[PDB]
Amino acid sequence: GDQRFGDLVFRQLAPNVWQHTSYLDMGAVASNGLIVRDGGRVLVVDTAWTDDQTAQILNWIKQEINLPVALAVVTHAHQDKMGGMDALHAAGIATYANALSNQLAPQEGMVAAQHSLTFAANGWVEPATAPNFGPLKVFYPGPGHTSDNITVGIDGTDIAFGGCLIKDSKAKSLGNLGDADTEHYAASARAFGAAFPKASMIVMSHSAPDSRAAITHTARMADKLR
Ligand SMILES: [Au+]
Ligand SMILES: [Au+]
Ligand SMILES: [Au+]
Asked: What's one GO-annotated cellular component?
């Protein structure tokens, strides 16, 4: 079910949803994002690690979907999620991130997105800051992998994207905690689960999609950090 296109891998998850995967030698580390077809347009969640890889995402979209990319949202200011911002801006694609991601971007070595999302006290995106997001339902679960990490449900499907906050249920660790909030991580993981309570396919940055057990297993590992 995987399609190789250049050095990237694309996998269809639902009629209008694909997972994009790019690799960086750190051996090679995979990072996943999403592509969503919404009527006559395409929406992207996360860049690839690099500008060149992100340009290949746009090329794959042109070939396999052939609809314009209306916007991209990136889920925190680290290289695996935001390293390819320049390719999006070069193509004239409107980009969105948590306001905090944009504020942190220079210190993290990332190019800021063009637009900033803000959030209610319950974590839901303020809709005026998510214009024409279509099926993308953005939720800020609280600090976890980073203080700025956001998550995205795909309305009309069984899919929710946890980004780097959620690890699969076979994970032995919580990955890179160098920028993490170890106090609040567990509650943030549980908040993601409660925000998308009917999602059955959990997509994440560094594992293949998993069931909801990924959320609970992650939260229970994060319980041990306190
Ligand atoms: Au990260
Ligand atoms: Au950092
Ligand atoms: Au990551």
From this structure: periplasmic space
DSSP state of 190: H
Q: What angle do CA 82, 83, 89 make, to 5 degrees?
A: 75
- Is residue 148 a contact partner of residue 98, using CB atoms and an 8 Å limit? yes
Question: Phi and psi for 191 in degrees, rounded to 5?
Answer: -65, -40
CA 195 / ligand 3 centre spacing (Å): 21
Least Cα distance to 102 among 129, 134, 128 occurs for 129
User: What's the CA dihedral at 206, 114, 99, 81 to 10 degrees?
Assistant: 10
Are residues 26 and 18 in contact, defined by beta-carbon separation less than 8 angstroms? Answer: no
Annotated ligand binding at 164? The verdict is: yes
Q: How far apart are alpha carbons 172 and 154 in whole angstroms?
A: 28
Token pair 């993308």: residue? 136
Give residue 36 CA to ligand 2 midpoint distance, Å. Answer: 29
The response to whether 20 counts as a known ligand-binding position is no
Domain layout of the chain by residue ranges = 2-224
Distance (angstroms) between ligand 2 centre and the Cα of 29 equals: 18
CATH number of 2-224: 3.60.15.10
210 annotated to bind ligand: no
107 CA distance to ligand 2 centroid (A)?
A: 7
Distance (Å) from CA 39 to ligand 1 centroid: 31
